[PDB]
A paper describes a structure:
Image processing of D13 trimers revealed a small subpopulation of adjacent trimers bound together, forming doublets of trimers. There are two major interfaces that mediate doublet formation. The first is located between one of the head domains on each of the two trimers. Another interface is located at the base of the trimers, which would be proximal to the viral membrane in the IV. The clearly resolved features in the reconstructed electron potential map between Y62 and R498 suggests cation-π interactions as the main stabilizer at this interface. Furthermore, the doublet is characterized by a slight twist of the trimer axes defined by a torsion angle of 8.0°, leading to an arched arrangement when the doublets are linearly expanded. The absence of the N-terminal tail α-helix in the doublet structure suggests that its displacement likely helps to initiate intertrimer interactions, promoting ordered assembly of oligomers and leading to formation of spherical IV-like particles.
In Vaccinia virus (VACV), copies of the double-jelly-roll protein D13 bind to the viral membrane via interaction with its partner protein A17 and assemble into a scaffold surrounding the viral membrane. This process leads to the formation of a spherical immature virion (IV). The 62-kDa D13 protein exists as trimers both in vivo and in vitro, and structures of the recombinantly expressed D13 trimer have been determined by X-ray crystallography. D13 adopts a double-jelly-roll structure composed of 8 antiparallel β-strands.
Numbering used by the authors:
A (entry chain D), B (entry chain F), C (entry chain E): 18 to 45, 49 to 547
D (entry chain B): 450 to 499
Amino acid sequence: RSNVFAVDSQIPTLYMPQYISLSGVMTNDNQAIASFEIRDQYITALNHLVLSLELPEVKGMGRFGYVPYVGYKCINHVSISSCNGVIWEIEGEELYNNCINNTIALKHSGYSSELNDISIGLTPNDTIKEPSTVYVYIKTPFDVEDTFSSLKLSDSKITVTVTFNPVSDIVIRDSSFDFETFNKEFVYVPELSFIGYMVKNVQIKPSFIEKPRRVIGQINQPTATVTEVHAATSLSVYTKPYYGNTDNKFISYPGYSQDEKDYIDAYVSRLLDDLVIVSDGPPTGYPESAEIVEVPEDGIVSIQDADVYVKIDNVPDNMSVYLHTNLLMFGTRKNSFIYNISKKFSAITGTYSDATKRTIFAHISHSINIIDTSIPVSLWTSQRNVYNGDNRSAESKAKDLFINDPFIKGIDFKNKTDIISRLEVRFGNDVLYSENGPISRIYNELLTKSNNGTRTLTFNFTPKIFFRPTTITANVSRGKDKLSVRVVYSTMDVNHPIYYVQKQLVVVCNDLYKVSYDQGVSITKIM
Amino acid sequence: RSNVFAVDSQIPTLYMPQYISLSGVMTNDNQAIASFEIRDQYITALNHLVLSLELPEVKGMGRFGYVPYVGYKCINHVSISSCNGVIWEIEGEELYNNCINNTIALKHSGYSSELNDISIGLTPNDTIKEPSTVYVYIKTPFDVEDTFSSLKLSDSKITVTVTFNPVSDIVIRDSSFDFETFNKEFVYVPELSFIGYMVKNVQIKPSFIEKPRRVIGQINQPTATVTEVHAATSLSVYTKPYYGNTDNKFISYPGYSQDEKDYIDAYVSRLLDDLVIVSDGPPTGYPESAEIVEVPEDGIVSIQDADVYVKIDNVPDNMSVYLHTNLLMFGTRKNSFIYNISKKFSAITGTYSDATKRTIFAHISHSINIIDTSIPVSLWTSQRNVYNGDNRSAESKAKDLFINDPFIKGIDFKNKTDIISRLEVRFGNDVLYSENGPISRIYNELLTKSNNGTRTLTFNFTPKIFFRPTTITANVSRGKDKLSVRVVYSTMDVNHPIYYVQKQLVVVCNDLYKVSYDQGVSITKIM
Amino acid sequence: RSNVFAVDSQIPTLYMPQYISLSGVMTNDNQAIASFEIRDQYITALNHLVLSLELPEVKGMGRFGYVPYVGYKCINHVSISSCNGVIWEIEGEELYNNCINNTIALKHSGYSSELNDISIGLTPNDTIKEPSTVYVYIKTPFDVEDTFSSLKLSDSKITVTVTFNPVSDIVIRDSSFDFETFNKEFVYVPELSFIGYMVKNVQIKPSFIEKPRRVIGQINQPTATVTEVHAATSLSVYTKPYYGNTDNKFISYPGYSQDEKDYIDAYVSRLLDDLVIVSDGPPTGYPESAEIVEVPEDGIVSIQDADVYVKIDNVPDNMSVYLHTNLLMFGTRKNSFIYNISKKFSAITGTYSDATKRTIFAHISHSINIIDTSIPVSLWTSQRNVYNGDNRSAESKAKDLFINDPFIKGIDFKNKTDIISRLEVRFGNDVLYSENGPISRIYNELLTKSNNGTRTLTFNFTPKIFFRPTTITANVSRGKDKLSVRVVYSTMDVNHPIYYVQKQLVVVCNDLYKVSYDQGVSITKIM
Amino acid sequence: DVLYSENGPISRIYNELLTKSNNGTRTLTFNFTPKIFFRPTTITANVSRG
C-alpha cells in the first residue's frame, strides 16, 4: 500500500530571493523607447516583470479621462535580449489577451472611478486628476512553475527594452481640451522590478519557450497567410476595425461602468435630452432637414409603422411637447429602406422640472443594441448618405469624444456580435479544419476558463514545463509549411451603417523555440 | 539536495488532437431520442462532450420566456453505450448539480437578457425571439485529468443517446400563448462535438469510474432505501416539491435578475398594483370578500395589531386613497391564527401620475421573505380555506405565469430554507451517522468550493485519478448491504400555506465500477 | 516516451473518515474561555476545524446590527495543546487575514441582510433578530495537502481552547439600546467539529509547521523590533488605528452594502438631510455658532472660493431654502487654512415632498473621500479645535453608532489610503530591504490572489509540504539575529483632522517549528 | 474527413469541358479511363475507417 499519511520531505537547493528595482534611460518615429540594463554577478535568475508608470497632474478646461487598463494599453512592444540577439518579444495585443482573465492584474493596471471617470474642468487652474502610479504585470512564459521556469542568466548581460504607444491612444478627450499642449509636455517615467534568486552551485539544463508571431491581412481581405510554420502550438483568428478613414469620433462612453446595459444606458441618456424638447413654440437651433412633430392629446405618435407612447408630467400650460422623429437616419436611395434611430423607441415617460428648466426622464423601453452605440459619428455624414444625416444641435455636437482605443475587437466594444460565419484553415493544399458555428471558441473558453476567448485551434494538451509540448509539424516534402486562413463574413443590410466599417483579419501563430545555454543564452527555432 | 531550478523534459506520446462534429438520427409520452454513432479505428480516445441545440423563431401573441440555463434544463437522460452494454449514464438533475459551480459553462448554456426576458407580443406576426444556439457542456468523469482520464475506444463502436424533456418544461408562458400549436411545431435539432486524439502505439491500462444512481421515495414519506450497495463513494440527500396535484401556476418570476432581492422586488411590484388603489369612491370590479378601507388623514391604518403608514403625494382634490386590508388570507379554523399578506407591509409612499393614471412607488419597508414568493397560486383557493382566499382582480389573475422548472429543490426557488431538522444513515443495523445542524452541508461547500452544496457524506479524500478511491464497503456476512436514510421534517405552523406542499425525499448513491479493455470496453460492478 | 494516456492506480491506506461533533465546557478579565478534550483511541488524525455559535434572540428598542463576519470577528485567540505544551496557536487578526481570500468561508461566517441590516424596534417587545447559527472555519496549517498534512494524534489527548472577545466588539448599536442588559444576559454557546480518520497501521514521520508571531510597537513610534529570529519565512508590516482616547462614535456605517461608493452614499445620505433645510423662517434647533444663509432666487450661493449650486423642486410658495455653510469645520489657528465640509459640495438638486415634509434628493456632485466617512465624531469637538465645531441638530446627534471593530487597518475602513511612504528593514546592522513604492504589496497580491494584501517580504517559493520550506537563517556569531523595522509616515496637512489619529505599527514574523512524534506530540524551535 | 470544397462553380466548368455539354451539373468525376476496354477507376470505401 502507498502511504497517503506521510512524505519524505526533500531539501531544496539553497537560495535567497530579493526584490530588485532599476530605473531606465529614455530615448526618442519619435516613439518612446526605454532601455534597462540588468548587470549583477549575483543574480542567477529572474522572473515576474513589473513596469511602473507615473501619470502627471492634468490641468485646464474640458472633459478628460483615461481608458481602462491604461497600463496595459500603453505597451506596444517588449523585448528581452542578450549578446546573441532577441530572446523574447510580444506585441501589446498579445500581452493584453494573455492577461485578460487575471482580474487582480487588471485591477492593479488602473481601474477605478478616480482614473476612469470622465472628469470636467471649469477653469484654467482646475486640477482634473491627481498624480498617481500604475503597475503593469508583464506576464511572461517565465511565470508558470515559479522557480522551475525562471530565466537563467548564464553569467551574461540581459537588457530589457519597452516600446511605448503614443499618448494620443490612451486618452479619451473632447475637442475643448488642449491636447497639443498636453502632448507637448507629457513624458513617460518608467521603472522595472523583478525577483532575483541567488543560487549556490546551480545546475542548468535546457528548456523550451513559445514566442507568439502575428500577421495582419490587408484591408477587407477574407484571407491571410502565415509563412514558415515548422512547429506551431496554436492558431487564433479575430478581426480589428480600422478607423483611419474617420476622425475617430464617437457619441458617448460610459467610463467606469462596463456592462453592456451600461453602454446602452449611456447612449440613451445622451440622446434623451435632444429627443423630447419642451419649448414655447416650434423649437429652434436644429438644422432645417429635421421633421419635429408635436404630440397629440391622446399621447400616441405614429411614425410610419412604429408607435411611440409619450407622456410627460407637470408640463406648464404655456408650453408644448415636441418629438424629433429623424434624429439619425441613413439611406442609399430616396424611397427605399431607412435606418432610423428614433423608430427604436416605443414608450417614453418622465417628469419635467421647472427649477432647472429641463426634463428628467424616468422609465424607457427600447431595443437599442451595442452596434448603434458603436457607430462612429463620421459614418452618419458620409458622401454615400442621400439624406442630411445628423440633425442634432451644436451644443450636443460639442460633447462628442475622440476615442483611439487600440485593442478593440469585432465591430463593437465588447466583441459581442460574431461577424465570422465560417472559418477554413488550410495546411498546404488540404483542408485541416472547417466549422460553421463557434464551436472552437466554446472549446477554447472551456479549456482555459476565460470569458473572452477567440477562435483557437489548440494542438497542445500536455502538462506544462515537465514535458516537451506536442506540436503540429511541417512536412516540407509534401508542401505543408504555410497556414492559410479564409473566412466568409456575415452578410449585413446595405442600409445599415455598420456595413461600411472596414475590417482586418488577424492571425496569431505560436511558434516553439529551443533555449540553450552553451556560451551565454541563445534561442533556436525548431525545424 | 533536490534540484528546483531544472527539469529533465520528458517526450510525450506522439499524438494529434482533432475537433469532430456529428449529426444525429432522431426518433420518437413520445419523447424524442437521438442516437449518434462514432465509428473510426483511428480515434483512440475522446472527452469534452458538447451538445448544441437550435432554438427556432417564435411568433404570435402572449408572454413568453425561457428558463435560465435552458440547454441544461432540456436534458432528461444521457446514455453512452457500446456492443457490451451501458458504459455510463446520468440523469439531468445529477448533471446540472455537477455543473452548477462552472460559471463559464452556465454562461454558454444560455443566460442573457435576450433569451430570459419575459417578452410581450401584441400582433399575430410579431417576432418574440430571434433564432439562436445554446451549448450544453456534458461534464463527465473523463475530464478530470485531461488526457489521463479520457475514454479509450478499443476499436469498438460507441453510441451516445440523449433523451429530451417535453417542451412544456423549458417554457415560461401565460394563458394567452398558444401552447398546443407551439408544441405541435417545435422539434429538437441536436448536434454533438468532442475532441478526438489520434494516438500512435497507445498503451491502455484499466481505470475506475463512478456511476450515479438515484432513488425516489414515496410522496410524503420520511424514508428511502438504496439496495445493492457494495462500494459507495458518497451519499446525497435533498428534497423536491411535487406540484402534480396543482396547476403549477405562480404569481411572478424575476427573469434574468436572479438575486433574492430581485425575486422579492418582482413579487412586491406584482402585489403593489393591487394593494394601494386610488379611486373615486369605493373601487369596483373586485370580489365581495374584499375588505377595502379608506386611509385616515394622519396616514395610519391599523389592521388589528399592525400599523400601515400610507402617504401619497399630489392626489387630486376629488379623489381618496384606499387600502386593501386582506389581499390574500389563509386559515384552518374560524378563530385561530390567520396568515394574512396585508399585515406584512409597514410603510407605503409614492407619487401619483396625472399623465398615466398610475402610481410610481418610491420607498417601501416590508418583511416579505422568499417563501411568500414561492407559494403556488392554487393553494390559496384550496378547499381547506374557510375564507374565500384570493381577492385579486381578474385583470391581475390573467397575468399569471405557468412554471414547470424541473430542477427546483427544497420548498422555494433558491433552496435557501433548510427543512431537514435531523438525518440518520444506517449501514446494516448500525447507526453510521446523525446530525442536527447542517454541518455536513458546510463541510461539502468547504471541500468542493461551491455555493450550492447539499447534505453529502463523502467517504473519499484521496487525490483523484492517481489513486483508487476510498469507499464504504459491504459486510455481506453481517448482512450490511443496504443504506436506509430517515429524516425528520421541521415543524411549521399549521396556518402557514407552505405546510401543505407535498415533498419527496431523493437519495443519490455513487457506486464504483471497474472498466476493462479485454476485447472492447466493458464495465463490471465491484463486489 | 512517457505515457500520457494511462497511469497505474496506487492502492491507498485503508481508512474511514467520520464527522465528529463535541460539546464544550465554558469557563471564565471576565473573558469567555471554552475548553474541549478530544480522547478516543480510534481517531488517528484530524483536520478541518469548524466552530459553531448560537446567537440568541435580541429584543427591545433602538438600532442594532451585527458587524460583517461576526464569527471571525469574535475570536481573540485559538490554542491547540497536548500534555507536552502548546502545539499551535494564532491570534484572531492573523486568522482573519489568512481566511480573507476565501469567499465561501466569509459567506458562512455570517454575511446577509438579515444579520447586517440596521434594524429598528419600536416597542419594548419588538423582536429585532431571529435566532440563527454561524460557522467559523478555523483554517490551520494542517489543511494544505488534505490527508498528507493532517495532525496525527499519537494516542495523546488534544485540547482546543477558544478565547472570545467581549460582545461589545461585534455589536453596532446607538445610545438608545440597553447595552448593559443585553451584555448581562448574553452568553456564548460554542460547539466544535472536525473530520477524523480511522487508519489501520498508520506510518508517521515528522513534518514542518509555521507559527505566526506578533509584536506591537508603542503608540506613535515609527519603530518595532522582533527578537529571537532564527528561521523566518516572511515579514509583514501594517498599521492599526487606536481609538482609546475617544468614545468610538462614528457618523455612519453602510451595513450589508460594502462598496466604497456605498460608504460614501450612506455618509452623504446622513449629511444631506441636515445640509438643505426647508423651513418657514430661519431654522431653529441649531447651536448659536451656525451660519445659515438663504439661497438667492438665482440659485447660486458663493462660499468664499467655493460655489454651491442649489436647485430644489416643488418647494411651496410660503417657504424658502437654506444652506448650512459650515456643518463641520476644523482649524488650528484663527486665520489660516480651514477644513470645511460644506465646501466639498458643488451641486445639490432634488424635489420637495409635501406628504413627508422632507426633501428627496436627486443628483449630487461631490468630492467626498473615505477619510471624511472615517473621522470619529470626537475629533471634531476636541480641545485643540479653535471653533465650536459641530452645528448639527441633536436629533442627528442621536443616530451616531458605537463601533469597536477590532480588525481595522489603515486609517479608513477600506485600507485604501496608503499612509506609509517609506519602509526600511534592518537585519543586524545591514539594510536588508528598502522601498519607496508599494512593490512588495503588489507582489503579495499577485502571488496570493487577494484584494487585501499587506506589505510582505516573502522568502519561501518552494512547493509546500513536499519540500522543506526555505528560510533566512540567523548568524548569531556575527550578531545578525533580530529584525528591526523603521517607517516614515507620509506628511499630512496640519489642518486635516486625520493628522491627530494615533497609529500603531504591527510586525508579523512567521517562525518555523519542527513537529516530532517521539512519545506524544512535541514541537522544537529551529536554531 | 472533408473530401472536397469549393466556392465557385469550378467543378461544373470542369464537367462541361470534359463532357462537351451545355447543361452540366456540379459533378465530381472520379473516372478518366477510356470506356469499355478498361475496368473503370473508382473511389473505394474503407469501412475500417468508417
